[PDB]
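Progress narrative, Year 2. Work on Serum albumin from Equus caballus advanced from sequence curation to structure prediction during this period.
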Amino acid sequence: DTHKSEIAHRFNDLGEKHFKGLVLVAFSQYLQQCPFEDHVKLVNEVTEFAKKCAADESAENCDKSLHTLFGDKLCTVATLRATYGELADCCEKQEPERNECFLTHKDDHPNLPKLKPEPDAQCAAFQEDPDKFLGKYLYEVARRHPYFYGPELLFHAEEYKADFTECCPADDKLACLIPKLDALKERILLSSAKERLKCSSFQNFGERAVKAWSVARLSQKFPKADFAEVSKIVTDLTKVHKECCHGDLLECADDRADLAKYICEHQDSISGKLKACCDKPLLQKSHCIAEVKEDDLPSDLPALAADFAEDKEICKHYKDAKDVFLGTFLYEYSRRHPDYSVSLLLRIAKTYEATLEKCCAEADPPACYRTVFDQFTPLVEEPKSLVKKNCDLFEEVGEYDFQNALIVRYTKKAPQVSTPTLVEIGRTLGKVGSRCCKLPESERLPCSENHLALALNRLCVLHEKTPVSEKITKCCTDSLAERRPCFSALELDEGYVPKEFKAETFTFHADICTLPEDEKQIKKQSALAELVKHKPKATKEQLKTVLGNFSAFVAKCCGREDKEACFAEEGPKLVASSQLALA
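Result:
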């Protein structure tokens, strides 16, 4: 898309403010390591370039591609080789090779110093210089989540800004700030995961698979819209994320804005839940539509049996126009089931497909495919009871022991996985119990299982980066719709050799006493996973007891007149005797 110069075009479409915002995000995700100012200089430089081009588009070099321009700007940076390692190789390559080299080296979980609210100093710096401050924010969130949805990051920057504004000045204290900043980081964390699943999908299953997922999700959201309105939106939205994921965020943001416009101007054909979204400033608008409540079910939903199970011309339809015919099933089944997870709907469309394949090659296909809806029952029953089992446990035991139950379940299934990772998924999925399990019954299953899909994908990108098990690699290669079943089936290698015991690994010391409550928990959950790695046959209940004993002992020695002497004289007794109590 152009005027003549793509850079002018996007400068014009987006405005300086959003243009500069997006350019920073792009430079940060591509160059995660570079200092802040070194990015401010390249953003400024490039922005000036665009400005100059908007004034005279036939100016020399204004007609270059965005890659050529942006990769050039990156490739001037910081005597790279000594700092940016391989990135420097990328700089030897022409387009599209270079861009492709750059994208290939994006780094997912890179260790940098994790996000930390510091109220007085941050506030000073905020009123001192908001654009530096907000920009620092983007740079920081972007370089830590190289696949974060660019235009949503601008959105959350505004939320970050509203926080500091109403909080620095009304100062009877700044626990005005910790609630909000804590709540933001989580919405940050979840949105990054939502998007990484989108970019993961493109990378591993291509665009069809992303389409299916959308058709299923958007049909749930906009069930009053016809198959045609849903495909259009889907086509438009796939192109938006395909862009964002391939790092073209300017084109991405511009096409997104066009989609927001298209949906606000056609609400009547799409959903009755858009009025208050469609009255908002652009960034609030888009975000509002991305998180829209599902619409009420229309009164004229077709009955499905007649079309998909009783029509005697199904095999022909399925031969003559397979994709249309499958898409229509997915659109219909989905709009009907806002209470199913997306992966569940994909698995059902796939069983529907596989049944027609078998049945149409037989002597009497309709006798065969007439019970196809009966194939779905088991499939629905499985997650439902999985969610019931987990919510029940969570309600009975609370968040911390639920997290613990999960950490045991996982470490037994994959003891080769690092302890901080085993503890982090357990903690995350425990939190999902907290959020999903208190919902009305019919929204529990998607909240749970949708959130669990984001966690599994995280697990599988992390795994590809640092792999430890073929069995996980295999779960991570299956379709999105089989991923969860494969993870549920994954189980402790009968031949797995217990991890040799290491006394130091279970020895606690006094430091623990002053740590924040969550850090105290991580340290305990860490030891939990280690206990399981060393005693992989130990009972949940034995683990709960030994771990109940490690907490008692920690509490006691932390309230001790001599904290160290307490730890040193009682720690070893309990380390030895705990081994004896694990089967």
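The radius of gyration is 27 Å. The longest helix spans residues 177-221.
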